[PDB]
């Protein structure tokens, strides 16, 4: 009827007890709550899986201006924001060539090709976690656009 109550916005915690309602604005200046000293990352994908990630791996700690800062706040970089480092070091590029992805891509049965492209990628990650020593933290599976646009539900 002729009434409309406005409820209050809660505030989220930040580094050393800072309370800013927004997330991006409160994190581009005050930093994350918890500190981790580095990101150990790996890239698995086609030949362009590295290079496209490589061009983007160093492109995130480098600042990029936004078209409108009021709507989209500035970001100075991964290091300046997340009090951590995210660069190309310790990466284990698994060579899933387009020929091996292709012998599994061009499969008549949809249920087989979704299972085959899963098994071909899942085993190569657990092996690196089982028959290897490199302590991985986040795995960046660079799936080619030709896969998720075709191998889609």
């Amino acid at each position: 009827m002729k009434e409309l109550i406005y409820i209050e916005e809660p505030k989220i915690l930040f580094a050393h007890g800072q309370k800013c309602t927004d997330a991006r604005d409160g994190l581009a200046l005050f930093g994350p709550l918890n500190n981790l000293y580095g990101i150990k990352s790996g890239v698995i994908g086609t030949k362009q899986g590295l290079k496209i990630f490589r061009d983007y791996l160093d492109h995130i700690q480098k600042p990029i201006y936004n078209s409108n800062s009021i709507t989209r706040p500035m970001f100075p970089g991964f290091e300046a924001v997340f009090d951590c480092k995210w660069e190309s070091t310790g990466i284990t590029f698994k060579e899933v060539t387009n020929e091996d992805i292709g012998k599994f891509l061009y499969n008549s049965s949809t249920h087989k090709r979704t299972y085959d492209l899963v098994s071909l990628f899942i085993d190569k990650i657990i092996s690196a976690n089982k028959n290897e020593d490199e302590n991985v933290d986040v795995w960046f599976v660079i799936v080619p656009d030709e896969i998720y646009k075709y191998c889609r539900p």
């Binding site: 409820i7 809660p10 409160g26 496209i52 995130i60 936004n66 078209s67 960046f140 799936v143």
Partner: protein
């Protein structure tokens, strides 16, 4: 064919954090259409964009971008979404997928339940009394072990109206100290209100309490700082209604809005749905790709 759900269904035994990235979304400039323009205008939003793929990579590596400081002690924000299992032979049963929020801001998750006495393919989306004591006690015990006592109350968020055939079985396992309140979140209700002057939608956080039990909270709308609403047209306010139990509907609006800023996969001002169920169905669709996983109450750094 959604192998991304199959991606993280077979990795739950080993618990490997993963991030499915795309050439199209990482080489947007390289990818153009046949008319000489990029298929997805991408870097003009290069703010939250780099935030999301970094704060998630921060989260998938164990980082904690933020927390919650306006939460009571002894309160659990249970949110469960029933997911169809059509990946299997029949959808005659539907698995559920719940999660829990603590006073410490550590949003966890756990596998829900299966519908045993599920009436036909898509019943009223409700767990049976025989297994009603399973999910709640597991959630209560999960809170009990890390706090020492059962919570003062649990808020069971859902998109489905609860029925008495499962709440009666809830009671004998809930201690009397737990205010077993059930809040149903239903976006399907077509409420809509405008602004007479101006081409801007109404402010996020506006609410209209209809009666002592139900309410309509605008978790999505116009914003006080970003000056642009998190939507195009006027959205449907989320219909909050206390299905069972006694509680203050005004105090409930604290919780629904609070579980919209924290989304540990994105950097947006707010979420249009409570993440107590937006995160809850983020594990149901993955866990329905394969049914050969016995998974513990995992975290979100794997899904």
């Amino acid at each position: 064919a959604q192998f991304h759900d199959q991606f993280k269904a077979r990795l739950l035994k080993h618990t490997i954090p993963t991030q499915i990235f795309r050439e199209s979304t990482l080489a947007w400039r390289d990818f153009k259409n046949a008319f000489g323009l990029p298929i997805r205008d991408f870097s003009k939003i290069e703010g939250h964009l780099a935030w999301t793929i970094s704060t998630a990579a921060f989260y998938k590596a164990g980082g904690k971008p933020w927390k919650l400081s306006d939460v009571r002690n002894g309160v659990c924000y249970l949110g469960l979404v029933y997911k169809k299992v059509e990946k299997s032979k029949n959808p005659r049963n539907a698995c559920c997928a719940a999660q829990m929020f603590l006073d410490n801001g550590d949003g966890t998750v756990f596998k829900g339940e299966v519908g045993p006495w599920y009436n036909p393919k898509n019943g009223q989306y409700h767990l049976e009394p025989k297994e009603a004591k399973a999910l709640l006690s597991q959630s209560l015990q999960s809170y009990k072990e890390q706090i020492g006592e059962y919570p003062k109350e649990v808020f069971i968020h859902a998109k489905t109206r609860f029925n008495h055939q499962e709440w009666d079985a809830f009671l004998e396992v809930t201690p009397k100290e737990t205010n077993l309140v059930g809040v149903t979140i239903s976006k399907t209700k077509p409420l809509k209100l405008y602004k007479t002057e101006g081409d801007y939608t109404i402010l996020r956080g506006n609410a209209y309490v209809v009666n002592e039990r139900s309410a309509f909270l605008w978790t999505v709308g116009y914003v006080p700082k970003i000056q642009t609403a998190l939507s195009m047209e006027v959205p449907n306010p989320l219909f909050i209604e206390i299905n069972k139990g006694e509680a203050d509907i005004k105090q409930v609006l604290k919780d629904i809005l609070s579980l919209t800023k924290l989304n540990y996969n994105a950097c947006i001002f707010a979420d249009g749905e409570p993440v107590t169920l937006r995160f809850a169905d983020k594990i149901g669709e993955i866990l329905t790709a394969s049914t050969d996983i016995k998974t513990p109450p995992l975290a979100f750094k794997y899904y």
